[PDB]
Every structure is written in C-alpha cells, then in structure tokens.
Copies of this chain bind each other. A is one copy, B any other.
C-alpha cells in the first residue's frame, strides 16, 4: 500500500533519548534528542521512510513473564504489533532473537560495575566474596537475565544473593541505580552496561567510576518484528553508517564532547 509513518519504540535513557530543554512547547520527534534520536534520523534517511518516535509506555526494555509468557517493554511493543521498529540501547540476546529480529550491532557493550569513588571493590569476584556492599541490576533487562541464567560460579553466587536480598537490590530505571550508588556512601554497587557506566562517569558530580573488566561482551541492535520488510534495509544501513565512521562520531558527540568531568 501507500507509504505509512513508521512507529519507532524507544526508551528515555540518557544519552540515547532525552527530553530537549524546551520540550514542553515542542511536539512529535522535536521533543527528543540524543544518540538514538540522531541514529533514527540517519537510518530513516537511508531507508527512505518517515517515522514517529514513541516512548515505550511501561519504560521497560523487555522481559518475558514466566507465568503468562507475555513480553513487556519495547520487546513487547514489537511482539504485539504496537511498534514497527525499536531504535534504542536494546541488547541482542538469544531469547529475544527467538521472537524478534535484530540488525547487526550498532554499539558494543559489556556488563560492568559502577561504584561510588573510593569503594574497596575491584571486580565481580570482589563483590561476590563480601556482604557489606550491596549490589543489584535493572529490572526487566538483559543484565538481570544474564545473572539469572549464568552457570558461571561467581555470577551464579551473585545471583543467589541478589534474588533474595532485602531490601530489594533491583531498580526500575538506570537513573534509580545511579542515585542509589551516589547516595549509599559506598555501600551499594550497580551492575549495568559499560556504555551507560561510561556515560555516567562523565556527568556531574563525577563521583562514580567503572571498575574491573566487563563481565561479558555483546551489542545493541535495531530491532524489528520477525519477518518485517524493514529488517534488510535497516541492517545494511547500520553497516554503512558503521563503515563511514558515523556511529563513532555519534558516540563521541554524546558521551565525551559533552562530558562534564574535564578533558
């Protein structure tokens, strides 16, 4: 049929998608800025479609309820036909690839540790061997599923602690995890993707840091419903933008050019 506006699901996650300072008087895509906003514009230009950015209603990345088998978050938006494409820091995973399609990765990341500066923690093994410093992850995301599923001894030990910790060590948004690190006087460490860790490390008040190596190695992909006619073009678009150096330029723009913690 005639061309239709593509519905893009995304999530309010800095610096991927952020409200512009004057958003209260703006409409449509103009309300937003950030890495994924710029990426969405590039992808759409290369694939030749118009689009509408829509923030996912439940503010979640996407997990499958064990009871009802219903997908929530952005994955759910794609699975149930509420969006045509997800352009967001959405991690490529086995269980998601079973139900949606992913482009080749546009950004690499690994699970990493965020501490308040001066916290006596250097590694995941460090965390697993003590109890004074609590630690947790985001809900409904790939990091929590990583620990839940891991058969690796250290990570399994961490999961058995996290799943039963009281009060809950899990948070609903990345921002909540960051606040919890900043406010807990070194007694909370946050497990999150290295991309978000490195971003926060450059924001005032510059009181956090990433420690140790990454726990795994993965990537974000642009996601489409299985069998979507958009998948092929979007995939080539990602590889073209990568080859041209544009993805590198966008990361520099949003992570480091705008960094608040010096040169």
> Which residues of A are interface residues toward B (Cβ below 8 A)?
92-94, 97-98, 102, 104-105, 108, 146, 149-152, 216-219, 235-236, 239-240, 242-245, 247-248
Contacts and interface: CB of A to CB of B under 8 A. Distances in A.
Given A217-B248, A235-B97, A248-B217, A243 B146 contact: yes
A240 B94 contact: yes
A239 B104 contact: no
A152 B245 contact: yes
A102 to B, nearest CB: 7
Given A217-B242, A218-B242, 16 more contacts: A93-B243, A94-B239, A94-B240, A94-B242, A97-B104, A97-B235, A102-B104, A104-B105, A105-B219, A108-B108, A146-B243, A150-B245, A216-B243, A216-B248, A217-B247, A217-B248
A102 B105 CA distance: 12
Contact of A94 (B146, B149, B236): B236
A111 to B, nearest CB: 11
Contacts of A92: 104, 239
Nearest to A243: B94
Contacts of A243: 93-94, 146, 149, 216
Given A102-B104, A104-B102, A105-B105, A239 B93 contact: yes
15 contacts: A92-B104, A94-B236, A94-B240, A97-B239, A98-B236, A104-B105, A105-B219, A146-B243, A150-B245, A151-B244, A216-B243, A217-B242, A217-B247, A217-B248, A218-B242
A93 B241 CA distance: 11
A101 to B, nearest CB: 10
Contacts of A152: 244-245
A100 to B, nearest CB: 13
A94 B94 CA distance: 24
A108 B217 contact: yes
Contacts of A219: 104-105
| Nearest 6 Cβ contacts at the A-B interface | A94-B239, A94-B240, A94-B243, A152-B245, A97-B239, A92-B104
A143 B236 CA distance: 19
A75 B185 CA distance: 55
A11 B85 CA distance: 37
Contacts of A218: 242
